[PDB]
Amino acid sequence: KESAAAKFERQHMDSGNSASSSSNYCNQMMCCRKMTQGKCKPVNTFVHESLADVKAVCSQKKVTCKDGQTNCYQSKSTMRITDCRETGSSKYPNCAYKTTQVEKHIIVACGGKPSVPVHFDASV
Amino acid sequence: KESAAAKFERQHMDSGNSASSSSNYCNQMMCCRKMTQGKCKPVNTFVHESLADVKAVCSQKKVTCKDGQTNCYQSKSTMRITDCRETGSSKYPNCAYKTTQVEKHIIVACGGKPSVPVHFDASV
Protein backbone atom coordinates (compact mmCIF):
# COMPACT_ATOMS: atom_id res chain seq x y z
CA LYS A 1 0.00 0.00 0.00
CA GLU A 2 1.49 3.31 -1.20
CA SER A 3 2.28 5.85 1.50
CA ALA A 4 0.86 9.35 1.05
CA ALA A 5 4.41 10.72 0.84
CA ALA A 6 5.38 8.32 -1.95
CA LYS A 7 2.16 9.05 -3.79
CA PHE A 8 2.86 12.79 -3.64
CA GLU A 9 6.35 12.27 -5.05
CA ARG A 10 4.94 10.09 -7.85
CA GLN A 11 2.10 12.44 -8.76
CA HIS A 12 3.81 15.77 -8.22
CA MET A 13 7.59 15.56 -8.42
CA ASP A 14 9.76 15.88 -11.49
CA SER A 15 13.08 17.50 -10.66
CA GLY A 16 14.83 14.59 -12.36
CA ASN A 17 14.52 16.99 -15.31
CA SER A 18 12.13 19.94 -15.76
CA ALA A 19 9.44 19.87 -18.46
CA SER A 20 12.19 21.20 -20.70
CA SER A 21 14.00 19.64 -23.67
CA SER A 22 13.18 16.86 -26.10
CA SER A 23 16.13 15.01 -24.59
CA ASN A 24 13.69 13.60 -22.05
CA TYR A 25 11.38 11.89 -24.56
CA CYS A 26 12.71 8.38 -24.03
CA ASN A 27 12.75 8.58 -20.24
CA GLN A 28 9.08 9.50 -20.27
CA MET A 29 7.94 7.19 -23.04
CA MET A 30 9.89 4.15 -21.87
CA CYS A 31 8.17 4.65 -18.52
CA CYS A 32 4.72 5.37 -19.97
CA ARG A 33 4.94 2.30 -22.20
CA LYS A 34 5.93 0.07 -19.28
CA MET A 35 9.48 -0.88 -20.29
CA THR A 36 11.11 0.19 -17.02
CA GLN A 37 9.30 -2.30 -14.78
CA GLY A 38 11.56 -4.64 -12.83
CA LYS A 39 14.29 -3.79 -15.33
CA CYS A 40 15.28 -1.09 -17.78
CA LYS A 41 14.75 -2.42 -21.29
CA PRO A 42 18.24 -1.53 -22.58
CA VAL A 43 17.14 -0.48 -26.08
CA ASN A 44 13.91 0.43 -27.85
CA THR A 45 12.69 2.15 -31.00
CA PHE A 46 9.52 4.20 -31.47
CA VAL A 47 8.04 4.78 -34.92
CA HIS A 48 6.14 7.99 -35.63
CA GLU A 49 4.62 7.20 -39.01
CA SER A 50 0.98 6.09 -39.19
CA LEU A 51 -0.01 2.64 -37.92
CA ALA A 52 -1.13 1.99 -41.49
CA ASP A 53 2.32 2.84 -42.89
CA VAL A 54 4.09 0.55 -40.45
CA LYS A 55 1.56 -2.24 -41.06
CA ALA A 56 2.13 -1.75 -44.79
CA VAL A 57 5.71 -2.86 -44.19
CA CYS A 58 4.53 -6.45 -43.79
CA SER A 59 3.91 -6.35 -47.54
CA GLN A 60 7.15 -4.72 -48.62
CA LYS A 61 10.73 -6.00 -49.02
CA LYS A 62 11.45 -9.42 -47.52
CA VAL A 63 14.66 -9.88 -45.53
CA THR A 64 15.82 -12.46 -43.01
CA CYS A 65 15.56 -11.61 -39.34
CA LYS A 66 18.61 -11.24 -37.13
CA ASP A 67 17.47 -14.37 -35.28
CA GLY A 68 17.23 -16.51 -38.39
CA GLN A 69 13.43 -16.52 -38.52
CA THR A 70 12.09 -15.79 -41.97
CA ASN A 71 9.20 -13.45 -41.35
CA CYS A 72 10.99 -10.09 -41.47
CA TYR A 73 10.32 -7.12 -43.70
CA GLN A 74 12.06 -3.85 -44.46
CA SER A 75 10.20 -0.61 -45.11
CA LYS A 76 10.43 0.66 -48.68
CA SER A 77 11.16 4.14 -47.32
CA THR A 78 12.73 5.82 -44.33
CA MET A 79 10.45 6.57 -41.38
CA ARG A 80 10.80 9.11 -38.59
CA ILE A 81 11.75 7.01 -35.57
CA THR A 82 13.17 7.59 -32.12
CA ASP A 83 16.03 5.55 -30.69
CA CYS A 84 16.16 4.92 -26.95
CA ARG A 85 19.33 3.51 -25.40
CA GLU A 86 19.89 3.15 -21.67
CA THR A 87 22.77 5.36 -20.53
CA GLY A 88 25.85 4.38 -18.58
CA SER A 89 24.40 6.39 -15.73
CA SER A 90 21.07 4.54 -15.81
CA LYS A 91 20.73 1.86 -13.14
CA TYR A 92 17.32 0.29 -12.43
CA PRO A 93 15.02 1.43 -10.91
CA ASN A 94 16.40 4.73 -12.16
CA CYS A 95 16.23 4.19 -15.91
CA ALA A 96 18.01 6.79 -18.02
CA TYR A 97 17.82 6.76 -21.81
CA LYS A 98 19.45 8.81 -24.53
CA THR A 99 16.95 10.09 -27.04
CA THR A 100 18.16 10.05 -30.64
CA GLN A 101 15.84 10.93 -33.49
CA VAL A 102 16.67 9.72 -37.00
CA GLU A 103 14.76 8.90 -40.18
CA LYS A 104 15.77 5.37 -41.23
CA HIS A 105 14.32 2.28 -42.85
CA ILE A 106 12.87 -0.18 -40.37
CA ILE A 107 12.89 -3.95 -40.31
CA VAL A 108 10.06 -5.70 -38.50
CA ALA A 109 8.78 -9.23 -38.06
CA CYS A 110 5.16 -9.82 -39.02
CA GLY A 111 2.67 -12.40 -37.89
CA GLY A 112 -0.92 -13.37 -37.24
CA LYS A 113 -3.82 -13.05 -39.70
CA PRO A 114 -3.94 -10.45 -41.00
CA SER A 115 -0.15 -10.36 -40.81
CA VAL A 116 0.83 -7.26 -38.84
CA PRO A 117 4.08 -6.13 -37.16
CA VAL A 118 4.80 -8.10 -33.96
CA HIS A 119 8.49 -7.36 -33.46
CA PHE A 120 10.85 -4.48 -34.22
CA ASP A 121 14.02 -6.08 -35.60
CA ALA A 122 16.21 -3.13 -36.57
CA SER A 123 16.50 0.19 -38.32
CA VAL A 124 18.76 0.54 -41.34
CA LYS B 1 -2.81 -11.86 -22.32
CA GLU B 2 -1.72 -8.91 -24.44
CA SER B 3 -1.67 -9.82 -28.12
CA ALA B 4 1.63 -9.69 -30.01
CA ALA B 5 0.19 -6.94 -32.19
CA ALA B 6 -0.92 -5.02 -29.09
CA LYS B 7 2.52 -5.29 -27.53
CA PHE B 8 4.22 -4.01 -30.68
CA GLU B 9 1.96 -0.98 -30.71
CA ARG B 10 2.66 -0.39 -27.03
CA GLN B 11 6.43 -0.86 -27.32
CA HIS B 12 7.03 0.75 -30.72
CA MET B 13 4.19 2.97 -31.94
CA ASP B 14 3.86 6.67 -31.23
CA SER B 15 2.29 8.13 -34.36
CA GLY B 16 2.25 11.90 -34.62
CA ASN B 17 4.15 15.00 -35.69
CA SER B 18 5.57 16.66 -32.58
CA ALA B 19 6.74 13.49 -30.81
CA SER B 20 9.18 15.08 -28.35
CA SER B 21 7.35 18.43 -28.27
CA SER B 22 7.04 19.94 -24.79
CA SER B 23 3.34 20.22 -25.61
CA ASN B 24 3.38 16.43 -25.16
CA TYR B 25 4.90 16.49 -21.65
CA CYS B 26 1.66 16.01 -19.71
CA ASN B 27 0.41 13.23 -21.97
CA GLN B 28 3.64 11.31 -21.41
CA MET B 29 4.14 12.13 -17.71
CA MET B 30 0.50 11.63 -16.69
CA CYS B 31 0.82 8.19 -18.32
CA CYS B 32 4.25 7.39 -16.83
CA ARG B 33 3.20 8.45 -13.32
CA LYS B 34 0.08 6.29 -13.63
CA MET B 35 -2.61 8.97 -13.42
CA THR B 36 -4.45 7.64 -16.48
CA GLN B 37 -5.25 4.18 -15.10
CA GLY B 38 -8.93 3.43 -14.68
CA LYS B 39 -9.66 7.00 -15.76
CA CYS B 40 -8.05 10.33 -16.60
CA LYS B 41 -6.99 12.36 -13.59
CA PRO B 42 -8.58 15.69 -14.56
CA VAL B 43 -5.98 18.12 -13.22
CA ASN B 44 -2.41 17.64 -11.98
CA THR B 45 0.70 19.69 -11.24
CA PHE B 46 4.31 18.49 -11.48
CA VAL B 47 6.86 20.49 -9.45
CA HIS B 48 10.34 20.79 -10.95
CA GLU B 49 12.18 22.08 -7.89
CA SER B 50 14.40 20.03 -5.59
CA LEU B 51 12.66 17.39 -3.47
CA ALA B 52 14.48 18.97 -0.51
CA ASP B 53 13.16 22.39 -1.56
CA VAL B 54 9.55 21.18 -1.84
CA LYS B 55 9.75 19.34 1.51
CA ALA B 56 11.07 22.58 3.01
CA VAL B 57 7.70 24.20 2.26
CA CYS B 58 6.31 22.15 5.15
CA SER B 59 8.18 24.48 7.51
CA GLN B 60 7.23 27.62 5.57
CA LYS B 61 4.01 29.68 5.47
CA LYS B 62 1.02 28.00 7.13
CA VAL B 63 -2.22 28.46 5.19
CA THR B 64 -5.70 26.89 5.22
CA CYS B 65 -6.28 24.31 2.52
CA LYS B 66 -8.80 24.88 -0.26
CA ASP B 67 -10.98 22.08 1.20
CA GLY B 68 -10.94 23.61 4.67
CA GLN B 69 -8.32 21.38 6.23
CA THR B 70 -5.69 23.22 8.26
CA ASN B 71 -2.45 21.45 7.40
CA CYS B 72 -1.49 23.38 4.29
CA TYR B 73 1.66 25.38 3.70
CA GLN B 74 2.67 27.72 0.90
CA SER B 75 6.13 28.03 -0.63
CA LYS B 76 7.96 31.24 0.22
CA SER B 77 9.42 31.43 -3.27
CA THR B 78 7.89 30.71 -6.64
CA MET B 79 8.79 27.38 -8.20
CA ARG B 80 8.94 26.13 -11.76
CA ILE B 81 5.88 23.93 -12.28
CA THR B 82 4.05 22.31 -15.16
CA ASP B 83 0.29 22.45 -15.13
CA CYS B 84 -1.57 19.53 -16.69
CA ARG B 85 -5.24 19.76 -17.63
CA GLU B 86 -7.39 17.21 -19.44
CA THR B 87 -8.59 18.62 -22.78
CA GLY B 88 -12.19 18.70 -23.97
CA SER B 89 -11.16 16.08 -26.51
CA SER B 90 -9.76 13.80 -23.81
CA LYS B 91 -11.89 10.88 -22.62
CA TYR B 92 -10.69 7.63 -21.10
CA PRO B 93 -9.13 5.40 -22.19
CA ASN B 94 -7.87 8.16 -24.46
CA CYS B 95 -6.57 10.74 -22.02
CA ALA B 96 -5.26 14.01 -23.44
CA TYR B 97 -3.74 16.95 -21.60
CA LYS B 98 -2.72 20.52 -22.17
CA THR B 99 0.80 21.20 -20.88
CA THR B 100 1.42 24.61 -19.30
CA GLN B 101 4.68 25.76 -17.76
CA VAL B 102 4.69 28.66 -15.29
CA GLU B 103 6.37 29.84 -12.10
CA LYS B 104 4.20 30.17 -9.01
CA HIS B 105 4.12 29.60 -5.27
CA ILE B 106 2.82 26.17 -4.37
CA ILE B 107 0.48 25.17 -1.57
CA VAL B 108 0.73 21.66 -0.19
CA ALA B 109 -0.74 19.72 2.70
CA CYS B 110 1.90 18.29 5.03
CA GLY B 111 1.43 15.26 7.21
CA GLY B 112 3.06 12.20 8.68
CA LYS B 113 6.19 12.16 10.80
CA PRO B 114 8.45 13.68 9.70
CA SER B 115 5.94 16.14 8.26
CA VAL B 116 6.30 16.08 4.46
CA PRO B 117 4.09 16.98 1.48
CA VAL B 118 1.17 14.55 1.16
CA HIS B 119 -1.11 16.52 -1.17
CA PHE B 120 -0.78 19.26 -3.80
CA ASP B 121 -3.46 21.80 -2.86
CA ALA B 122 -2.88 24.75 -5.18
CA SER B 123 -0.43 27.08 -6.86
CA VAL B 124 -0.56 30.86 -6.83
Rounded Cα gap, residues A120 and A48, in angstroms: 13
Residue A79 contacts residue A48 (beta carbons within 8 Å): yes
Q: What are phi and psi of A116, to 5 degrees?
A: -120, 165
Catalytic residue among B12, B18, B34, B114: B12
Q: What are phi and psi of A50, to 5 degrees?
A: -65, 155
- Please answer yes or no on whether B8 and A49 come within 8 Å at the CB atom: no
* Residue A15: closest CA among B56, B9, B74: B56
Selected residues 56-75 of chain A with any CB under 8 Å from a CB in chain B: none
List the single residue in B with minimal CA-CA distance to A79: B15
Rounded Cα gap, residues A4 and B100, in angstroms: 25
| Partners of A84 in beta bridges | A44, A99
Catalytic residue among A1, A12, A34, A113: A12
Rounded Cα gap, residues B121 and B55, in angstroms: 14
Whether A119 is catalytic is: yes
User: Resolution reached, in Å?
Assistant: 2.2
* Per CATH, domain A1-124 is 3.40.50.410: no
Residue A47 contacts residue B8 (beta carbons within 8 Å): no
List the single residue in A with minimal CA-CA distance to B31: A32
